[PDB]
Amino acid sequence: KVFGRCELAAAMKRHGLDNYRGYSLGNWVCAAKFESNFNTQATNRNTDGSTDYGILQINSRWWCNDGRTPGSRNLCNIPCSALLSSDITASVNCAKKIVSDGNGMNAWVAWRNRCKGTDVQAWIRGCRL
Numbered sequence: 001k002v003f004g005r006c007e008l009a010a011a012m013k014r015h016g017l018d019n020y021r022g023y024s025l026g027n028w029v030c031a032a033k034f035e036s037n038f039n040t041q042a043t044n045r046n047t048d049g050s051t052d053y054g055i056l057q058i059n060s061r062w063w064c065n066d067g068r069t070p071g072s073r074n075l076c077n078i079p080c081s082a083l084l085s086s087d088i089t090a091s092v093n094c095a096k097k098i099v100s101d102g103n104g105m106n107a108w109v110a111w112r113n114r115c116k117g118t119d120v121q122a123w124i125r126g127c128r129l
């Protein structure tokens with residue numbers, strides 16, 4: 001599924017991401033835009049052989065099992081394919097674990113480089129929430 005901007009904002013709000021660990025909704029929408037272009041089916045392979053999955057590009061090295069990343073962890077206890085669903089629940093629940101592990105949203109490279117320190121409220125402007 002390719003989400004619209006306000007559609008995704010509303011979905012993330014319903015799932016409890018607004019101000020989660022102090023990160024306003026606009027941060028999450030900005031991260032999803034630059035990680036996946038709002039596409040739940042996005043995948044990208046990394047140099048170390050791991051793969052990133054879904055709307056928030058969650059990495060198989062640590063967070064999910066895809067059966068082809070040797071010696072990796074599965075800290076969200078899910079198959080990586082669950083992260084590609086049109087239902088974003090699994091992605092949101094795993095993201096809550098990631099953002100709580102000490103490094104906040106710096107775990108997402110696109111957030112650090114393209115969202116952090118910008119007017120992220122612009123990403124939810126005009127939306128009926």
Ligand SMILES: [Cl-]
Nearest residue numbers: 021103104105
């Ligand atoms: Cl933080």
Ligand code: NA
Nearest residue numbers: 060064072073
């Ligand atoms: Na893994």
